[PDB]
Amino acid sequence: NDQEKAHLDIAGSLEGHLRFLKNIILPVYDKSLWDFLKLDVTTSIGRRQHLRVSTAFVYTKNPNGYSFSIPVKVLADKFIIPGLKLNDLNSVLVMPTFHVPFTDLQVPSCKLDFREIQIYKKLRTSSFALNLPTLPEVKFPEVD
């Protein structure tokens, strides 16, 4: 199962030594097995006997086919998507930086759009810790 095709294949092999049973005679026909079958190999004497079964299922699909995807614009460091232009709410909201007390978290500003969708490719979080004397202070370094 991949993005190209679907493949289901099952095989079975049966081997035996059904030799003593190929040597049977039909008294009602007054003729033997292989005589009535008119087959000698594997049938007259009975050699190593085999049975093979094979099942193959293949479906072909296109990796693109019908691809309906949302249009996304990538300029430098932000993805801009032309969402539905419904002029009902405000135009754009700017959330400046905010400092969380009792820690050192630095959240950068954001610009959220109503008509379109703007997302920032990279988000940067500064390092911050606590103030615990004679205790193991867990300092979290910056993450992008």
């Binding site: 087959l39 193959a56 293949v58 296109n62 995807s69």
Partner: protein, 96 residues
């Protein structure tokens, strides 16, 4: 400890530790990608030296027509058990 048993505890100094936070990734859908039907093949085969049979069904979709090919062959030790059936059907759709 010295107050209770005149024996002070050994001093333990447990240093810095570095805890790993794995690089986590969340993948969210963007759009639908529904593949187009091109070909479907189903083959069944049985082999025995008294009976060898093979059926093959092939359903193809080319341009605006679906083709369907059916093969059914069989062989045996009796001179009236070995047959071949073939079927070819083309169905072209033009605006209904």
């Amino acid at each position: 400890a010295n107050k209770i048993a005149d024996f002070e505890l050994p001093t333990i100094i447990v240093p810095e530790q570095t805890i790993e936070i794995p690089s986590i990734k969340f993948s969210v859908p963007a759009g639908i990608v529904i593949p187009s039907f091109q070909a479907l093949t189903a083959r069944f085969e049985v082999d025995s030296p008294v009976y060898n049979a093979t059926w093959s069904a092939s359903l193809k979709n080319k341009a605006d027509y679906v083709e369907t090919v059916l093969d059914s062959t069989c062989s045996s030790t009796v001179q009236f058990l070995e047959y071949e059936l073939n079927v070819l059907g083309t169905h072209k759709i033009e605006d209904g």
